Enzyme design. Structure first.
Site, short mmCIF file in Angstrom:
data_model
loop_
_atom_site.label_atom_id
_atom_site.label_comp_id
_atom_site.label_asym_id
_atom_site.label_seq_id
_atom_site.Cartn_x
_atom_site.Cartn_y
_atom_site.Cartn_z
N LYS A 16 13.69 -17.66 -13.41
CA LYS A 16 13.87 -18.31 -11.36
C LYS A 16 15.73 -17.63 -11.77
CE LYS A 16 15.44 -22.88 -10.90
NZ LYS A 16 15.22 -23.95 -10.52
N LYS A 21 19.86 -16.10 -17.37
CA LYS A 21 19.17 -14.85 -17.99
C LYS A 21 20.64 -13.89 -18.13
CE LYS A 21 17.26 -14.23 -13.97
NZ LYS A 21 17.18 -15.31 -13.39
N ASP A 135 12.64 -15.02 -9.06
CA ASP A 135 12.03 -15.63 -7.85
C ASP A 135 10.80 -15.51 -7.28
OD1 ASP A 135 14.81 -17.89 -8.46
OD2 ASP A 135 14.97 -15.98 -7.80
N1 LIG Z 1 22.84 -21.79 -22.60
C1 LIG Z 1 23.86 -22.42 -21.93
N2 LIG Z 1 25.18 -23.10 -22.01
C2 LIG Z 1 25.44 -23.40 -21.18
N3 LIG Z 1 25.45 -23.27 -19.57
C3 LIG Z 1 25.24 -21.76 -19.32
C4 LIG Z 1 24.03 -21.77 -20.88
N4 LIG Z 1 23.39 -20.33 -19.66
C5 LIG Z 1 23.88 -20.65 -19.20
N5 LIG Z 1 24.91 -21.19 -18.76
C6 LIG Z 1 25.46 -21.48 -17.03
O1 LIG Z 1 24.51 -21.58 -16.36
C7 LIG Z 1 25.15 -20.51 -14.76
C8 LIG Z 1 24.28 -19.80 -14.88
O2 LIG Z 1 23.98 -18.65 -16.37
P1 LIG Z 1 23.53 -17.35 -15.37
O3 LIG Z 1 23.21 -16.26 -16.78
O4 LIG Z 1 24.17 -16.02 -14.70
O5 LIG Z 1 21.65 -17.59 -14.69
P2 LIG Z 1 21.17 -16.80 -13.89
O6 LIG Z 1 21.46 -15.19 -14.68
O7 LIG Z 1 19.53 -16.25 -14.41
O8 LIG Z 1 21.61 -16.31 -12.68
C9 LIG Z 1 25.98 -20.28 -15.47
O9 LIG Z 1 27.52 -20.85 -14.96
C10 LIG Z 1 26.65 -20.27 -16.70
O10 LIG Z 1 27.61 -20.80 -17.60
#
Ligand SMILES: Nc1ncnc2c1ncn2[C@@H]1O[C@H](COP(=O)(O)OP(=O)(O)O)[C@@H](O)[C@H]1O
Ligand SMILES: Nc1ncnc2c1ncn2[C@@H]1O[C@H](COP(=O)(O)OP(=O)(O)O)[C@@H](O)[C@H]1O
Ligand code: SF4
Ligand SMILES: [Mg+2]
Ligand SMILES: [Mg+2]
Lengths: 276, 279
Positions: A16, A21, A135
């Site tokens: 999602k 990711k 999504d």
């Molecule tokens: N293991 C984790 N611990 C704390 N924060 C996290 C972790 N993984 C992701 N985040 C936070 O969640 C938010 C979204 O992460 P992201 O990897 O970019 O999601 P996606 O790539 O699926 O859209 C970011 O602001 C990131 O700092």
């Protein structure tokens, strides 16, 4: 399609939006390169275009679609679209058309096809990752399953209903192309949100799906701290607990042999699980 | 024609990130327009989740247009099977979509809207028509309400979450793309709050920079889940609770809205800088 990095483990991370990711993909690739000396490459298949930001040090990677749109087809070069980051990790970003213009996944089709014609996937690669949008499973976002770019698929998800719903839909898409392209579900990664009983919920969710919980990634503030310093958790502090969590996950993915055909759940089954 | 679809009705479309509260906001908004203001409302679910009209029909998810087509057939699909009446005579339709990976996720929206035009499922005497659309990707069937101009007023549901604001900013880009082409405009931004300090202030600056207004700050309330467990919308469950009054205020603000604008989307640097400022 088997000629793309034959001796490399081709993996694709689905999930999602905003579930973690890009964070998981980058830190897992960084752990494989820094700790296990593996030649890794990341291909961002998310229209957000920030799947390779912390490996490139807070330098948004010009997407393939952005270069192709303004400069032209002849102007797309490996030096421009493919940049090197932390521990010689190769980075590529597909991007996509502007919202409303056309298929959101088109950017993935053009970037993958151009990367093949330009020979951007080295043969000596050890691991190749595809950070894909989960999504919707269609068009360019379904290409890694349809065409078989990656044989091992891992779905990052949290305890919330929508994250599990998206994960269940991704499992349906994996099953659709499992026999067609030999694609399989490696495991489920749980990017936890620090909630009691979440670790137990994921164990039953994976059991019902016919898969395993590859790792329980905890929610840690060090991720933001490392982000604000234009870096990944591994590059920022490889001795912190969160870095050791990503190291365990990296080893589990690279040593995973339990590839399975999932058994998706019905809406009633999924709804009954979240309430429990 | 598109303008022929319910001419005397206010055609609105709710966009937003997945699980941000579009289905909850749309259902309660329509319930408050039908119950408190006696309006004839209709909801057309354009989300592949197929639960946008669940609480109006009371608990059970509606059979989608794609499902009846995939099981019965083209001629076997009738206006009775796909359009069902719920709380306060609110008409409900669910587009659905193809099975994951089969084809374009938005194809269910095109098929259902075109089939609804042919079956004349949009009554002329309607007062308000809502389209609960998926906002994670703005393309294909999900971009049809903007491209074809099914709805003239668009409202984006979002929270202080970076991803929620990113999706909202992308929806604004899509609105601007078809603003001149189909006369589609951004009515405002709905904030489905997650009870965080400084969230309202963040939304005020986000809407200011986007050239729009915060139509309403919907607070996070447990009564929503309570009403959901009783197979009901908050309005139908307890129209006297504070959350019901919040949805009532939102319903009249949307119905009484004139400030329709062409948004000014922000760059990624501008949007991060805003999230880092407050958060
Ligand atoms: N293991 C984790 N611990 C704390 N924060 C996290 C972790 N993984 C992701 N985040 C936070 O969640 C938010 C979204 O992460 P992201 O990897 O970019 O999601 P996606 O790539 O699926 O859209 C970011 O602001 C990131 O700092
Ligand atoms: N105002 C609110 N207060 C409390 N919970 C809410 C509110 N709005 C939505 N929710 C909850 O959020 C979850 C997702 O809501 P939903 O409307 O289905 O999102 P979407 O339709 O955008 O996918 C539901 O479990 C619902 O109970
Ligand atoms: S195939 Fe998917 S990404 Fe492409 S237009 Fe359709 S819904 Fe959008
Ligand atoms: Mg990302
Ligand atoms: Mg919805």
């Amino acid at each position: 399609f088997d000629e793309i990095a034959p001796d490399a483990k081709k993996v694709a991370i689905y999930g999602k939006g905003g579930i973690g990711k890009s964070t998981t993909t980058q830190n897992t690739a960084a752990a494989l390169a820094y700790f296990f000396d593996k030649k890794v490459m990341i291909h961002g298949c998310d229209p957000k275009a920030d799947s390779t930001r912390m490996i490139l040090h807070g330098k948004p990677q010009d997407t393939v679609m952005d270069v192709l749109r303004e400069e032209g087809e002849e102007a797309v070069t490996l030096e421009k679209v493919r940049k090197i980051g932390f521990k010689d990790i190769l980075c590529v970003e597909s991007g996509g058309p502007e919202p409303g213009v056309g298929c959101a996944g088109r950017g993935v089709i053009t970037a993958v096809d151009m990367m093949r014609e330009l020979e951007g996937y080295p043969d000596d690669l050890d691991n190749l990752f595809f950070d894909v949008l989960g999504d919707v499973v269609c068009g360019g976002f379904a290409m890694p399953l349809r065409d078989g770019l990656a044989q091992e698929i891992y779905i990052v998800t949290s305890g919330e209903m929508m994250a599990l719903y998206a994960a269940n839909n991704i499992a349906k898409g994996i099953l659709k192309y499992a026999e067609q392209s030999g694609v399989r579900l490696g495991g489920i990664i749980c990017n936890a949100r620090n909630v009691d009983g979440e670790k137990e919920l994921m164990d039953e969710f994976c059991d019902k799906l016919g898969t395993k919980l590859i790792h329980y990634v905890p929610r840690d503030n060090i991720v933001q701290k490392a982000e604000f310093n234009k870096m990944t958790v591994i590059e920022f502090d490889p001795e912190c607990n969160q870095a050791k969590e990503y190291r365990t996950l990296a080893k589990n993915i690279d040593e995973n042999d339990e590839l399975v055909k999932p058994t998706p759940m019905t809406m009633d089954e999924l709804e009954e699980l979240v309430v429990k």
